[PDB]
Short mmCIF file of N, CA and C and ligand atoms in Angstrom, two decimals:
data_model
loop_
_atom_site.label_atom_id
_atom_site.label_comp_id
_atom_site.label_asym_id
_atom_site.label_seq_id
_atom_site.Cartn_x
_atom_site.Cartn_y
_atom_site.Cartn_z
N UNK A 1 -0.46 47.40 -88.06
CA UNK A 1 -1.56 47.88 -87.21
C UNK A 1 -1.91 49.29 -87.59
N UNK A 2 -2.53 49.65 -88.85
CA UNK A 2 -2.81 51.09 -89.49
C UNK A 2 -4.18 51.17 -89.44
N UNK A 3 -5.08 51.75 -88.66
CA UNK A 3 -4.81 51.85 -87.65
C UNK A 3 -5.82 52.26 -86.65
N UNK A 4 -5.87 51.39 -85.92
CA UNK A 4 -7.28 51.16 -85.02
C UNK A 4 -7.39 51.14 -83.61
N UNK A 5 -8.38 52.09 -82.94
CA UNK A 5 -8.29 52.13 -81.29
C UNK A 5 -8.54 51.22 -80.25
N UNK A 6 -8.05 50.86 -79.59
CA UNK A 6 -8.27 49.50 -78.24
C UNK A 6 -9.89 49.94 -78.05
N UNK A 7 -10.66 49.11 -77.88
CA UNK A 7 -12.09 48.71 -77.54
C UNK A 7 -11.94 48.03 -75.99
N UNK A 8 -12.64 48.49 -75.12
CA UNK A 8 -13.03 48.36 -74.08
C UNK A 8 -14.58 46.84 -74.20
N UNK A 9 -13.84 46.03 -74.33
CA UNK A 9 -15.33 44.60 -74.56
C UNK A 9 -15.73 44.25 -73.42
N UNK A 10 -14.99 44.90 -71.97
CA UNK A 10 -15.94 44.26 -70.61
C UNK A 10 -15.13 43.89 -69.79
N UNK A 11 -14.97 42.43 -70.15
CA UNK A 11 -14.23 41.97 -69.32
C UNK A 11 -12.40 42.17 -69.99
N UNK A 12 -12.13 42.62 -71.26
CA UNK A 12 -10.63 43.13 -71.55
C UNK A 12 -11.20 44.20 -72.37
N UNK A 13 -9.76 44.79 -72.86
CA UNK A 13 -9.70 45.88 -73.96
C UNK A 13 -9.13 44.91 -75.38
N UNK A 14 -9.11 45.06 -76.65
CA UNK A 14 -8.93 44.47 -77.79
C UNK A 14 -8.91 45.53 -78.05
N UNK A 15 -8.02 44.78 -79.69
CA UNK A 15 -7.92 45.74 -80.86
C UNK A 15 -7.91 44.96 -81.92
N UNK A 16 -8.54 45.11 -82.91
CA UNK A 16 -9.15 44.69 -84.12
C UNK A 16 -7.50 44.76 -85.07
N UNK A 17 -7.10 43.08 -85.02
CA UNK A 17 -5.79 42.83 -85.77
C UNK A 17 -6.21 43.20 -87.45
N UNK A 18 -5.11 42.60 -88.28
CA UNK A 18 -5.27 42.72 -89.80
C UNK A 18 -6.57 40.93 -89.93
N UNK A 19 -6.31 40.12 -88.89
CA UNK A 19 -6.95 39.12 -89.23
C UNK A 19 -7.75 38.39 -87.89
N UNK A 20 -7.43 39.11 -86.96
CA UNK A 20 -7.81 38.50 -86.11
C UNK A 20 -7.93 39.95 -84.82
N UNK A 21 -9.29 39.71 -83.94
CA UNK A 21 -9.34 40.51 -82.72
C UNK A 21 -8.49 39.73 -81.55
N UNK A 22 -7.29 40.85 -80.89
CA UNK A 22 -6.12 40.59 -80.54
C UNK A 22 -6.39 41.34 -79.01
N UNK A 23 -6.34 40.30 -77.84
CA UNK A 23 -6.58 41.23 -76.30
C UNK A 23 -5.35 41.72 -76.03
N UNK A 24 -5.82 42.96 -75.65
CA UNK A 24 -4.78 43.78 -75.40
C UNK A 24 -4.85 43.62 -73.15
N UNK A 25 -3.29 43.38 -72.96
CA UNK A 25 -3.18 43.15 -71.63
C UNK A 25 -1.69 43.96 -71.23
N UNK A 26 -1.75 44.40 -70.38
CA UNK A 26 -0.52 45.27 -69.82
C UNK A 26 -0.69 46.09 -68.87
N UNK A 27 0.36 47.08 -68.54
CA UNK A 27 0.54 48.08 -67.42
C UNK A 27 -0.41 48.72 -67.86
N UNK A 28 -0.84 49.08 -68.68
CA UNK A 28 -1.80 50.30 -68.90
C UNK A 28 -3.31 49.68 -69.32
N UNK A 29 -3.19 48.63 -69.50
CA UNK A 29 -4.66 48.23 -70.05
C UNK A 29 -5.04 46.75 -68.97
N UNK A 30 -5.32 46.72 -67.91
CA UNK A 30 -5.79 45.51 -67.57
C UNK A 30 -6.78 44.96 -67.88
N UNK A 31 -6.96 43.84 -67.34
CA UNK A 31 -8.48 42.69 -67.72
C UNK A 31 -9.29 42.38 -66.14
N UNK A 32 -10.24 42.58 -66.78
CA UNK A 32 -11.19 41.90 -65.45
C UNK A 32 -10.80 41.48 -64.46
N UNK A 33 -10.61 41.67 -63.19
CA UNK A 33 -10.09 40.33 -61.95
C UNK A 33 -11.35 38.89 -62.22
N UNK A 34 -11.79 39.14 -62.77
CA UNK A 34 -13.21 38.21 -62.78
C UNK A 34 -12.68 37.80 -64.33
N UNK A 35 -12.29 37.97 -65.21
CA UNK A 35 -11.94 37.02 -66.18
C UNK A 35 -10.92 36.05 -66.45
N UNK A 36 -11.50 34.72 -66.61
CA UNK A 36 -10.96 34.11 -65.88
C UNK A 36 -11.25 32.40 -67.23
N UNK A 37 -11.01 32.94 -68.54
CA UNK A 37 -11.12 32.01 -69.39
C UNK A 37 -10.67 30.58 -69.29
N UNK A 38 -9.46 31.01 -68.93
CA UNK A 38 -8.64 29.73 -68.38
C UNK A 38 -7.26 29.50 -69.79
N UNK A 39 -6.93 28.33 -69.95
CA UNK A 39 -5.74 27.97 -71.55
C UNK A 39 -7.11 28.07 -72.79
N UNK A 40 -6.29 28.91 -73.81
CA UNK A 40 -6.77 28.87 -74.91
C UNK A 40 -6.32 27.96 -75.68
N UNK A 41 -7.12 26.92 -76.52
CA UNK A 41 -6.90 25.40 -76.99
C UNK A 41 -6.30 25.62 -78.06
N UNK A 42 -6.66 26.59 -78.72
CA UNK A 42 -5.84 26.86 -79.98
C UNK A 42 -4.75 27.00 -80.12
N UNK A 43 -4.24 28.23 -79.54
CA UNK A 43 -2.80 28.60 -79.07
C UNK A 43 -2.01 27.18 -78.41
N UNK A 44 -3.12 26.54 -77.17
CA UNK A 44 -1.95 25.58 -76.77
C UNK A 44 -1.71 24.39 -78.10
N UNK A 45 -2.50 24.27 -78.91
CA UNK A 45 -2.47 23.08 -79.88
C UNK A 45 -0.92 24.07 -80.66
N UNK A 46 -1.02 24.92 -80.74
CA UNK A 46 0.10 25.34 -81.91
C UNK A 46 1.30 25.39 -80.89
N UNK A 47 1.08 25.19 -79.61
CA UNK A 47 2.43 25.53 -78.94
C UNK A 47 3.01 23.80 -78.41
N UNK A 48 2.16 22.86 -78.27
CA UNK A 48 2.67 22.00 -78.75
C UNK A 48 3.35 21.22 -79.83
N UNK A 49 2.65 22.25 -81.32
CA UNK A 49 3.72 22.07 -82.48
C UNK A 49 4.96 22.49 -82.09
N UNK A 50 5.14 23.83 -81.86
CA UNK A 50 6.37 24.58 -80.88
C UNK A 50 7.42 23.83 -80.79
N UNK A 51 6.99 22.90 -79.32
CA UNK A 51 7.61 22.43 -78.60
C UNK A 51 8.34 21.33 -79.25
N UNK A 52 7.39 20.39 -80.24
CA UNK A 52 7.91 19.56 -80.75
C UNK A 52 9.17 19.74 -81.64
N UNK A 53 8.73 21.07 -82.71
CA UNK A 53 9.40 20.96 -83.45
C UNK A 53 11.13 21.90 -82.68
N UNK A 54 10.93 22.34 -81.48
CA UNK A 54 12.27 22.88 -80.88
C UNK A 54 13.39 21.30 -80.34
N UNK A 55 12.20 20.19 -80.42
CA UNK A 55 12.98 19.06 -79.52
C UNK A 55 13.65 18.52 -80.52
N UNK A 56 12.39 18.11 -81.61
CA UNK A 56 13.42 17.47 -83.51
C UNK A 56 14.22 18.54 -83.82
N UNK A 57 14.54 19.65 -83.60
CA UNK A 57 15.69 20.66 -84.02
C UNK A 57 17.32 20.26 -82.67
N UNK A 58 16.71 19.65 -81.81
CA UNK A 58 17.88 19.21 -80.99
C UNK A 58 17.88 20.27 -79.89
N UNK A 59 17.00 20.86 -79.43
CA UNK A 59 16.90 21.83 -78.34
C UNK A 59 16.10 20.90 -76.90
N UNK A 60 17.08 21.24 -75.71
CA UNK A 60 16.44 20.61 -74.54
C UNK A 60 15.83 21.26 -73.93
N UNK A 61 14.35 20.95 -75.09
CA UNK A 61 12.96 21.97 -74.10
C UNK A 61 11.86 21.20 -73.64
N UNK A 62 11.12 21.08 -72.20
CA UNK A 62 10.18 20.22 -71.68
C UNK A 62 8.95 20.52 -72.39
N UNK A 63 8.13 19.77 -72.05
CA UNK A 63 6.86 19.18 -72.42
C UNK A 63 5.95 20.33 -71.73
N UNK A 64 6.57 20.84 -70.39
CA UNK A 64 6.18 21.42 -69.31
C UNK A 64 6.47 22.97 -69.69
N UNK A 65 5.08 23.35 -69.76
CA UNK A 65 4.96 25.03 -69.44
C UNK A 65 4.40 25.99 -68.50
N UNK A 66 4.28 27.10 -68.25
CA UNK A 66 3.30 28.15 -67.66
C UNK A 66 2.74 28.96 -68.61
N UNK A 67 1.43 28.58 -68.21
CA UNK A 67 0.49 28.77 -69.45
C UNK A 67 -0.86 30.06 -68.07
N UNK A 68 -1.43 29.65 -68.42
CA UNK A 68 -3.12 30.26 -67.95
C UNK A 68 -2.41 30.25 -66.33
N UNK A 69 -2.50 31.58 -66.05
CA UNK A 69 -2.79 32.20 -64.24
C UNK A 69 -3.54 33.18 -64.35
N UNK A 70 -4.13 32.53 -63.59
CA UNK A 70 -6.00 33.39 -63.14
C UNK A 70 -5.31 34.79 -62.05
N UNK A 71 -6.53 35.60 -61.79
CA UNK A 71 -5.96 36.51 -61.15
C UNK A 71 -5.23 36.11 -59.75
N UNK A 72 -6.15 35.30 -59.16
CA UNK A 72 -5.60 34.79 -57.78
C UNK A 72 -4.49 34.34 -57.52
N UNK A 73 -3.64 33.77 -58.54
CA UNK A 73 -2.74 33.02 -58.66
C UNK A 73 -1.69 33.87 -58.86
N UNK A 74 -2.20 35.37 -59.61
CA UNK A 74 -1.09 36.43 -60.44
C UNK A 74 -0.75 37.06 -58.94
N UNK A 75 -2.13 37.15 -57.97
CA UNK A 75 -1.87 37.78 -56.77
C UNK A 75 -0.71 37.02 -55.34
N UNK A 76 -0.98 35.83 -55.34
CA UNK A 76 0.24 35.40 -54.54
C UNK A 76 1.67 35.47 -55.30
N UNK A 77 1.79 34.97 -57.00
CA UNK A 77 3.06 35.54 -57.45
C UNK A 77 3.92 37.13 -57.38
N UNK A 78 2.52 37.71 -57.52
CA UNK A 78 3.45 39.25 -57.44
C UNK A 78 3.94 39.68 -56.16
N UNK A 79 2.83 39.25 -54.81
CA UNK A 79 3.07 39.54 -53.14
C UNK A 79 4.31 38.51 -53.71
N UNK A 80 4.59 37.63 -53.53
CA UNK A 80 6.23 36.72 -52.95
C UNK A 80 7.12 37.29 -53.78
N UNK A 81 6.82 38.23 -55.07
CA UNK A 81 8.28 38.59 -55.63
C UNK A 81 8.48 39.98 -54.62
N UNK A 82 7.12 40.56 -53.59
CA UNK A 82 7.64 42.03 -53.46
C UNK A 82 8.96 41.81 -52.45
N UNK A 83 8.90 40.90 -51.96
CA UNK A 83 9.92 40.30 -51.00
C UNK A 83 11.12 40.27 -51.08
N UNK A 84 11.62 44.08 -53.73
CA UNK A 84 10.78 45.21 -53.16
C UNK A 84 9.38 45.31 -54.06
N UNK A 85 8.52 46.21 -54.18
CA UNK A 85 7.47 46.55 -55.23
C UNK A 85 8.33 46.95 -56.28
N UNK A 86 9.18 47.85 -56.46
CA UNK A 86 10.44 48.38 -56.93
C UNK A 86 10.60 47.64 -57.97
N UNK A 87 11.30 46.62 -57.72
CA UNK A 87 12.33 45.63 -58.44
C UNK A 87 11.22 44.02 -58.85
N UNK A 88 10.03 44.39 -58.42
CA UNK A 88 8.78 43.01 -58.74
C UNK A 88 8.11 43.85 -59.87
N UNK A 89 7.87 44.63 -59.78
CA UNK A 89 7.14 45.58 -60.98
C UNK A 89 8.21 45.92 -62.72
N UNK A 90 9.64 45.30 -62.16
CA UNK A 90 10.48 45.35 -63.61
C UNK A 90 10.23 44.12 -63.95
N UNK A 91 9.72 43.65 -63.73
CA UNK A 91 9.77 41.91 -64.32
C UNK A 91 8.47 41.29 -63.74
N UNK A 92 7.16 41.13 -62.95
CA UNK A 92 6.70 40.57 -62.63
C UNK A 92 5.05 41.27 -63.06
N UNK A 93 3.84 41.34 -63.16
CA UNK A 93 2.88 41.32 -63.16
C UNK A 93 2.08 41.96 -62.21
N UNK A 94 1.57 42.79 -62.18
CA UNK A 94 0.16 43.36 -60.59
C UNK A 94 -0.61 42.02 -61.54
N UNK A 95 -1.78 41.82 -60.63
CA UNK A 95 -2.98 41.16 -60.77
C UNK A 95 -3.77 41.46 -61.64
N UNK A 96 -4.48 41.07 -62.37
CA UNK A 96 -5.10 41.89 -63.66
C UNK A 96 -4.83 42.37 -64.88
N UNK A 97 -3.43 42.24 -65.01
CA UNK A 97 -1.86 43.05 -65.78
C UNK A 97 -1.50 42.20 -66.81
N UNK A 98 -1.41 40.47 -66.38
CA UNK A 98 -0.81 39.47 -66.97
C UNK A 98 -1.60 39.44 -68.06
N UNK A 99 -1.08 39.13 -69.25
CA UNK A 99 -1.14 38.20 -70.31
C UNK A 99 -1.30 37.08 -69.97
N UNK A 100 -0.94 35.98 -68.78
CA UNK A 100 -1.08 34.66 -68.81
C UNK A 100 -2.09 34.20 -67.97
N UNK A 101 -3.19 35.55 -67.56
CA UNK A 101 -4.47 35.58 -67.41
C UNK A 101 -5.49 35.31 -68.59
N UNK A 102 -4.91 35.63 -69.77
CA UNK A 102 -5.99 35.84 -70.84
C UNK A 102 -5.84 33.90 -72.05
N UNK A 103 -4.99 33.31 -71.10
CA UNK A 103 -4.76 31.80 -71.75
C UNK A 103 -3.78 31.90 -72.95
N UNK A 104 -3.33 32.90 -73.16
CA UNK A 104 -3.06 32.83 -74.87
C UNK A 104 -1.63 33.39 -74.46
N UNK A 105 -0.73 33.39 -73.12
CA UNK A 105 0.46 33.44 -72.64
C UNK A 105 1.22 31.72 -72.41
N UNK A 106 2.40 31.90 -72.83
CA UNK A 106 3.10 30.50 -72.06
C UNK A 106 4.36 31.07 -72.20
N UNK A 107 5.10 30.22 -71.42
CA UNK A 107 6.23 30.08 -71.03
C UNK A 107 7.31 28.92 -71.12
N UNK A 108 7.88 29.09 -72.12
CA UNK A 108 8.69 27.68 -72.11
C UNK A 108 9.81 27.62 -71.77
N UNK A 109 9.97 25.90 -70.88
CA UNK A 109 11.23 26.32 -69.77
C UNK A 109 12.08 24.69 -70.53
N UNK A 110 13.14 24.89 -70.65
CA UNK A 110 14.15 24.06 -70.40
C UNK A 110 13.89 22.61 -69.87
N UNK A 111 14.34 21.17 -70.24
CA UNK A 111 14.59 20.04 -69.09
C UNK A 111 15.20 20.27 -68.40
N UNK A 112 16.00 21.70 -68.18
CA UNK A 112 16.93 21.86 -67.13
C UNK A 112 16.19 22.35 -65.81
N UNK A 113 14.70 22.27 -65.87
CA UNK A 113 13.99 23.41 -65.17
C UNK A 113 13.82 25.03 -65.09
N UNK A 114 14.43 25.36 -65.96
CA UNK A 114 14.86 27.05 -66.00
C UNK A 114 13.92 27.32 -67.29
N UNK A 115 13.21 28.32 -67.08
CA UNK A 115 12.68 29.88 -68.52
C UNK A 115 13.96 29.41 -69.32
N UNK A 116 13.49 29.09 -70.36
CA UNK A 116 14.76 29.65 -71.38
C UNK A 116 15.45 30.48 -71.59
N UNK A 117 16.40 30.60 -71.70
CA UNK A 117 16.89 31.81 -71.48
C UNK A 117 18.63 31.60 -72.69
N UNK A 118 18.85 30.32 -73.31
CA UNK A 118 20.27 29.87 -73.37
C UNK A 118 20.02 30.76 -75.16
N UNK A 119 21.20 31.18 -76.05
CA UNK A 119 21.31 31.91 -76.81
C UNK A 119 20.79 31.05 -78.28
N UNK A 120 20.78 30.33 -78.40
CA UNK A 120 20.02 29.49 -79.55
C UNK A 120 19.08 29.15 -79.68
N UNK A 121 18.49 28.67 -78.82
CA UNK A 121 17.02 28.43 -78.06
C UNK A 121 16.27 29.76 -78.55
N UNK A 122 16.84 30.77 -77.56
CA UNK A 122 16.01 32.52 -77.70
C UNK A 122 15.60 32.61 -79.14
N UNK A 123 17.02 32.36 -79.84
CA UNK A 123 17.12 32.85 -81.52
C UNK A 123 16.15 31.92 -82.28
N UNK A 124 15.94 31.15 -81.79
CA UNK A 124 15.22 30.20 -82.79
C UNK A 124 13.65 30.44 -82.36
N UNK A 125 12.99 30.64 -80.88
CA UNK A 125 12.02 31.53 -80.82
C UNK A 125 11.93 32.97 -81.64
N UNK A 126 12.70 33.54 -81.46
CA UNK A 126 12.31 35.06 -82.47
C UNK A 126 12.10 34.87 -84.05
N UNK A 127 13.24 33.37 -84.70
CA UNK A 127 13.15 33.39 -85.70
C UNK A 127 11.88 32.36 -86.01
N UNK A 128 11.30 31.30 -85.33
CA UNK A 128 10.36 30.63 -85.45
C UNK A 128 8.81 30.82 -84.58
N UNK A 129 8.75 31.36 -83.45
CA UNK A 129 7.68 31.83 -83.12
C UNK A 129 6.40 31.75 -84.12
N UNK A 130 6.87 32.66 -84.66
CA UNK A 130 5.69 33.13 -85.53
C UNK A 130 4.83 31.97 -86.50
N UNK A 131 5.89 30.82 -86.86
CA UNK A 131 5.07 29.95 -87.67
C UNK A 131 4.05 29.42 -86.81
N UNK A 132 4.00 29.36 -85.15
CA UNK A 132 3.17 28.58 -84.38
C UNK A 132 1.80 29.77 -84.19
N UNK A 133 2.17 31.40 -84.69
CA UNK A 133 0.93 32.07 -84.50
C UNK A 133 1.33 33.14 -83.21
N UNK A 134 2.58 32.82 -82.41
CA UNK A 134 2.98 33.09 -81.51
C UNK A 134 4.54 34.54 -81.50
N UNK A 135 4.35 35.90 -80.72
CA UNK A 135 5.39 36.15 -80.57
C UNK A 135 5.84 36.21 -78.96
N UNK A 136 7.40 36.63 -79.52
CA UNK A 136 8.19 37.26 -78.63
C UNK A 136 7.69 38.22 -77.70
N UNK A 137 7.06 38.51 -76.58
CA UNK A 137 6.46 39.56 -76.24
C UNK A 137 7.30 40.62 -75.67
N UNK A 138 7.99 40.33 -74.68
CA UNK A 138 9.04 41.18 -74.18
C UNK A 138 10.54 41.18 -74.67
N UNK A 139 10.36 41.96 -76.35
CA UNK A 139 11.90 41.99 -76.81
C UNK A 139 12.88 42.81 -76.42
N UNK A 140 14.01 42.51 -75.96
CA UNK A 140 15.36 43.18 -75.71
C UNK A 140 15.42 44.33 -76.73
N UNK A 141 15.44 45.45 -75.72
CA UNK A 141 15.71 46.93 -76.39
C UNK A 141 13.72 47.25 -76.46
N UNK A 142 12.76 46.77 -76.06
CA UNK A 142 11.92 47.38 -76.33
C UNK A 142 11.18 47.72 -74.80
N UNK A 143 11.68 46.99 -73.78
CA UNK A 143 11.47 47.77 -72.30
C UNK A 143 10.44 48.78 -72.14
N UNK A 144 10.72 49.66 -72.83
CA UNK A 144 10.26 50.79 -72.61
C UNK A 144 8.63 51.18 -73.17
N UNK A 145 8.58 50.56 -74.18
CA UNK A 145 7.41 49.96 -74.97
C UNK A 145 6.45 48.78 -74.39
N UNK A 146 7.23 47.87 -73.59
CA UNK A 146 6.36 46.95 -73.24
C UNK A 146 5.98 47.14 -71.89
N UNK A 147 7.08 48.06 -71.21
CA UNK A 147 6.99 47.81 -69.68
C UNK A 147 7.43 46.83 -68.83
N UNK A 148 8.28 46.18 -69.43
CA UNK A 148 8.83 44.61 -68.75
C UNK A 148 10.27 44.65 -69.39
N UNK A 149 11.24 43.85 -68.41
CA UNK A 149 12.42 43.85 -69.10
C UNK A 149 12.52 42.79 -70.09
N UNK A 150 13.01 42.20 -71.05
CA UNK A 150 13.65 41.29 -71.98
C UNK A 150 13.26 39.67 -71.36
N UNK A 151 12.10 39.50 -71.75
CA UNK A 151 11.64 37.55 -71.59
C UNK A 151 12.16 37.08 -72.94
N UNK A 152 13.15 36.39 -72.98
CA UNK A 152 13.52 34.82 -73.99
C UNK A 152 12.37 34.09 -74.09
N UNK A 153 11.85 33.71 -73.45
CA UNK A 153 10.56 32.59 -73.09
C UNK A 153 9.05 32.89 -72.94
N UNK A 154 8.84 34.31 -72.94
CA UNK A 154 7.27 34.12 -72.95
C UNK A 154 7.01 34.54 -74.25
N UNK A 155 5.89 33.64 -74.84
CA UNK A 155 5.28 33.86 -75.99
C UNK A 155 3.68 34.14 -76.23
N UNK A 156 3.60 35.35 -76.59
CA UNK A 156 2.41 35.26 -76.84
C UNK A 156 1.66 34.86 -78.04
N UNK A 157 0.28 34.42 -78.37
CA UNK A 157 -0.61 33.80 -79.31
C UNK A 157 -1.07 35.35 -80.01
N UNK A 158 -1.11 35.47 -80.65
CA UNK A 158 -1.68 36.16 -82.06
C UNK A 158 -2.60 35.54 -83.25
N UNK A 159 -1.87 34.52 -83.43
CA UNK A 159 -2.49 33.80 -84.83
C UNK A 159 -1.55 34.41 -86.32
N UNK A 160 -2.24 34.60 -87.12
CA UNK A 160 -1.65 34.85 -88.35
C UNK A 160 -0.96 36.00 -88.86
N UNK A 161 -0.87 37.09 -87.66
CA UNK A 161 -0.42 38.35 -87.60
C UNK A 161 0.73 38.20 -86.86
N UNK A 162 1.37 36.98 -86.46
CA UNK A 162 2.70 37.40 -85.71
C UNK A 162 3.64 37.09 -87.16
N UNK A 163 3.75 36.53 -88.11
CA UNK A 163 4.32 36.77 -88.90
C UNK A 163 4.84 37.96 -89.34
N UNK A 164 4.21 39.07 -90.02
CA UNK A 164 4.03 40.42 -90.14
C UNK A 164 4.54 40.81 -88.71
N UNK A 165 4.04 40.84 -87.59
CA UNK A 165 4.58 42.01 -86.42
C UNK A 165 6.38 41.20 -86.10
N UNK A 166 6.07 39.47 -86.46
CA UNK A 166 7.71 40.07 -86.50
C UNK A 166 8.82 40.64 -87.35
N UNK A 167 8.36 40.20 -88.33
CA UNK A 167 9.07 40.93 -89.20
C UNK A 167 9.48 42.46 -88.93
N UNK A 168 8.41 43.06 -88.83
CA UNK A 168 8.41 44.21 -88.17
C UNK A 168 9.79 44.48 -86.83
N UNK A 169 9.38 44.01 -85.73
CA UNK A 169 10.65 43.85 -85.17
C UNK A 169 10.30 44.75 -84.11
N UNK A 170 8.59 44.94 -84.22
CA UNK A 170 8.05 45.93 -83.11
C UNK A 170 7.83 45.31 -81.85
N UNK A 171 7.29 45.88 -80.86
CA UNK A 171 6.20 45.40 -79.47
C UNK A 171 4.96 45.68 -80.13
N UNK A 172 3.93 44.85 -79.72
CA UNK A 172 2.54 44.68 -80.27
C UNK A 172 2.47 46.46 -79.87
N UNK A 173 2.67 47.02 -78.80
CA UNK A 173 2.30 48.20 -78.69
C UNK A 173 2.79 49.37 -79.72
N UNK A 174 3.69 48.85 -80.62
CA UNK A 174 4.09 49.81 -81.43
C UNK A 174 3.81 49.40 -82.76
N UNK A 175 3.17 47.84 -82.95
CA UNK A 175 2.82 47.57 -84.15
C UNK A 175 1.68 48.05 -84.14
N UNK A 176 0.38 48.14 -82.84
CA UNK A 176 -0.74 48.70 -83.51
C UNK A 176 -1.19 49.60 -83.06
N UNK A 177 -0.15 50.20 -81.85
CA UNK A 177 -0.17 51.81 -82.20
C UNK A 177 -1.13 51.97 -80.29
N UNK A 178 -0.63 51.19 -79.58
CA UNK A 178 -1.40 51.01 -78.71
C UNK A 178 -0.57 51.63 -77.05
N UNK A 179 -0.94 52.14 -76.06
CA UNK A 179 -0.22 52.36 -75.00
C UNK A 179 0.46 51.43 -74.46
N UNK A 180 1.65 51.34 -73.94
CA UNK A 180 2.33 50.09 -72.60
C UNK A 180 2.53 51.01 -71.67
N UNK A 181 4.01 50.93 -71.65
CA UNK A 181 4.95 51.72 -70.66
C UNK A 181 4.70 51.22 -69.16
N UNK A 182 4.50 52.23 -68.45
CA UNK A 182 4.10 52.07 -66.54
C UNK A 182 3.04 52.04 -66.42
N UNK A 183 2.40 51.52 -65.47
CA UNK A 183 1.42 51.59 -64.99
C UNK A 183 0.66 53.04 -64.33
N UNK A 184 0.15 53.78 -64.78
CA UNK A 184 -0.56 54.63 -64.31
C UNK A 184 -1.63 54.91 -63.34
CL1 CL B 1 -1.45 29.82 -87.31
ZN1 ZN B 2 -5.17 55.30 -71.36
ZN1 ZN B 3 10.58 29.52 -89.33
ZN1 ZN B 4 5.31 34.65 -69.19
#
């Protein structure tokens, strides 16, 4: 990401990838309460490759994800986690905040019903992600960069640039040079 400034397009902020324009979503950059795309077809077509190819590798992962939450939806999840603001804001989303507002977020959970979370599973996301177009978004040890603690399971869509950013071994915010952190 050498090196180009987030664009304000309206309803999100972007930044102009090596191959692709990439929405930028986080503590510091929200999206529209009014945007409201819904699942991006692309991303989900490659995350059903994903899935498949984690089940022929012998991994017990469902069919079943969390994909696209609209703002309304981000707003009853974040009120039931405050239940403090404190401790919902290390791990959970304000309204407007999510990535899995912009369709191009999922979440893949286990037949056990659980986020993934088991140590082979994780590893084989960080090491395979990327062929589906998809990274790691919230990597362990980068907290501080992303603003969220350590997700195993959410992946975000990129396209042909998550190859390169993983390798890298960055947060999108440090591959293209972009703000996270807290919310301001
Ligand atoms: Cl791809
Ligand atoms: Zn700013
Ligand atoms: Zn691979
Ligand atoms: Zn997620």
């Amino acid at each position: 990401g050498s090196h180009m400034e987030v664009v304000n397009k309206g309803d999100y902020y972007s930044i102009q990838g090596k191959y692709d324009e990439i929405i930028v979503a986080n503590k510091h950059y929200p999206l529209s309460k009014d945007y409201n795309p819904g699942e991006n077809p692309t991303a989900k077509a490659e995350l059903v490759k994903l899935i498949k190819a984690m089940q022929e590798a012998g991994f017990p992962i469902s069919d079943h994800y969390s994909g696209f939450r609209s703002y309304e939806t981000q707003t009853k999840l974040y009120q039931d986690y405050v239940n403090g603001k404190e401790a919902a804001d290390r791990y959970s989303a304000r309204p407007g905040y999510s990535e899995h507002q912009t369709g191009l977020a999922f979440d893949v959970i286990g037949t056990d019903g659980d986020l993934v979370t088991e140590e082979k599973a994780a590893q084989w996301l960080l090491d395979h992600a990327a062929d589906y177009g998809f990274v790691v978004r919230y990597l362990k040890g980068k907290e501080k960069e992303t603003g969220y603690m350590a997700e195993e399971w959410h992946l975000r869509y990129v396209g042909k640039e998550a190859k390169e950013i993983a390798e890298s071994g960055l947060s999108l915010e440090e591959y293209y040079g972009f703000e996270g952190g807290d919310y301001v």
